[PDB]
Subunit: 68 residues, 7 copies
Amino acid sequence: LKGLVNHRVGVKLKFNSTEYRGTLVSTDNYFNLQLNEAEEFVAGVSHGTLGEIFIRCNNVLYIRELPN
Amino acid sequence: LKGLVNHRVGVKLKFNSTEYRGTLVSTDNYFNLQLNEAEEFVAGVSHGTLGEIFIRCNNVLYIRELPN
Amino acid sequence: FLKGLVNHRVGVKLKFNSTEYRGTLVSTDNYFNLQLNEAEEFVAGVSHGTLGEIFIRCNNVLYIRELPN
Amino acid sequence: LKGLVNHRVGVKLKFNSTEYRGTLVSTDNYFNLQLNEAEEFVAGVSHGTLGEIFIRCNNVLYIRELPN
Amino acid sequence: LKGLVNHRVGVKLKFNSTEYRGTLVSTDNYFNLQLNEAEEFVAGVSHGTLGEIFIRCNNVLYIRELPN
Amino acid sequence: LKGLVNHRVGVKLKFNSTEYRGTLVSTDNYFNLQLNEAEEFVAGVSHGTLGEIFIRCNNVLYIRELPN
Amino acid sequence: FLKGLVNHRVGVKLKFNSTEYRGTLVSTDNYFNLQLNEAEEFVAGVSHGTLGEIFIRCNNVLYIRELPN
């Protein structure tokens, strides 16, 4: 996962279809991650900008690299 | 995460759309945290002040810093 | 953590429903497994009775607060 | 928790409104407990006697001491 | 729990009202247990024999000794 | 659990009534097991053959030995 | 411990729904935390799109299988 630090990513949660997008500032094996300039996406539509958020592994389905 | 100690944060839970906002007094890797002058928000509307609360990691979706 | 709340009149809110157990926090441990004395069950803010000493399990706990003096 | 051994206790489960009452034979930190002369109670009504049961922590909401 | 080895027990699951009945061959702290000549019971009715099954703690609410 | 290696088994899941049938290639205390020649059974009706599949403990209810 | 599948075309089926992510398993570890490349989302057997490289958490995983070429 460290290969995605300082990259634009999207974190998808288990429930609903919400995706947090931002820059991956940091993380840990535990999949606990810090996201900078995060923006909440629901079914692909922005529902706003949170600032920096710290997200818990458990709620996470997967992480992907947002496209260039 | 300790970077947020003494800051004004918002803890969002997995279920509903409830957020607890207050000052983050203390924490630990376990994402168990102490929140001072906590106020419970339901869909962004205040439903009251709790005092000092101690919140368990499992119920937390993420944490953010409340805009200054 | 919680050790600061021992001997304090506390409210323990569960994840499900709107039930809060109020009592004196006798003891705890990192695991958020706690012993409440003089526990009184509250449903939607309404007393549904007094249990005695109860031993509650972290898991079901949403948060714990300090009841207003 | 060992202060209740050999006491008449009630074990309340997470789901339903079922509680098992009996004599707490033994235990361990894990809240895995041994109940003797356990009787199942649904909404406060006896649904019969189990014998010895070994209960698992997880399903446990709380344990109380039954009125002498 | 090893006190029930070689006894006739019932393993009740969290969900439903299924109980697996059989003879407790072996176990471990983890409540992972081996059942021999296991028979599945739904609401107290047999729905058939499984042979030997290995059951996982989690799915377990409790274990009881079947009346001799 | 290792006594079932190379045996023909059925892995039942917590949810639905789905059982994965196949040969138990390997395992570990964690109940994470590798199945060969896995066939998906839904209410006792085959819905197709999977190849080799790796199953995660959590979703598992029990493991049984398919009658020789 | 499921290192026999690396560089193999796999399917990751989640617990909930009937979604399977298909791709090449780049890397992993005991924890069943896995890295999938050229991942494609399949709902009831129908492609709903390509994701890039995605990193999947164990918990949501029901099982993994080898894709049949």
